[PDB]
């Protein structure tokens, strides 16, 4: 600054700390319902797809981890038919674990 | 005088009444992701007697 | 396919529609002191066409 200011390069960056980045599997990126339109669009359904993903990140100079969440339904139904009996049925879908 | 206020939405019917009913249903059905509310004037008029 | 989504409440009826109507009245009658609402899943589903 002032009459004697030195010629200068401009640097720009951003921070976004407590957030976790998201990409909705919905045809226009909006939350029209919890069960998205594309998740019903019976192409990405019964006749099953392979998925490849690639990320470019700043090199860190130490070993780090990509944390990737595949958002799915993770619902339980709990039935109590007789005194002291709990039958709980789980379904996580897609990415279901259990026969 | 009212013929000009009515045409220009200074007085008279609300947007939910002057728009064709087909468009009002369209707006009600899409309002959560495409919003049509900010594009139509709704008059408000003070009472003139009593 | 929907038989599983309906049984597991990922799509289909709301809790106000699949619960027996006696329980829906019990809940509405007690809701200010004993709250049953948070124990039943309500699906929400995006529109698939148009």
């Amino acid at each position: 600054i002032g009459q004697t200011a030195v010629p200068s390069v401009t640097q720009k960056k951003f921070l976004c700390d407590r957030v976790m980045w998201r990409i909705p599997f919905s045809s226009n990126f909006m939350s029209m319902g919890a069960l998205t339109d594309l998740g019903q669009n019976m192409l990405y359904a019964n006749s099953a797809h392979a998925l490849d993903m690639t990320f470019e990140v700043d090199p860190m100079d130490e070993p780090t981890l990509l944390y990737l969440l595949f958002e799915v339904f993770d619902v339980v139904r709990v039935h109590q038919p007789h005194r002291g009996v709990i039958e709980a049925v789980y379904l996580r879908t897609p990415f279901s674990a259990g026969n | 005088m009212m013929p000009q206020w009515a045409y220009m939405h200074i007085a008279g019917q609300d947007a939910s009444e002057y728009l064709s009913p087909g468009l009002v249903q369209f707006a009600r059905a899409t309002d959560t992701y495409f919003s049509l509310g900010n594009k139509f004037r709704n008059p408000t008029v003070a009472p003139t007697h009593d | 396919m929907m038989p599983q989504w309906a049984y597991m409440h990922i799509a289909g009826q709301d809790a106000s529609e699949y619960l027996s109507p006696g329980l829906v009245q019990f809940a509405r009658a007690t809701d200010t002191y004993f709250s049953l609402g948070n124990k039943f899943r309500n699906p929400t589903v995006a529109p698939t066409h148009d």
Binding site: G33 | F26, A29, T32, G37, F40 | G12, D14, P43
Partner: peptide
């Protein structure tokens, strides 16, 4: 000092979150 439409409703996912 003024205001418009938008105070009108239809958000339920069953019964309809898009109907013609």
């Amino acid at each position: 000092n003024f205001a418009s439409l938008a105070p009108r409703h239809g958000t339920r996912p069953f019964m309809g979150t898009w109907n013609e």
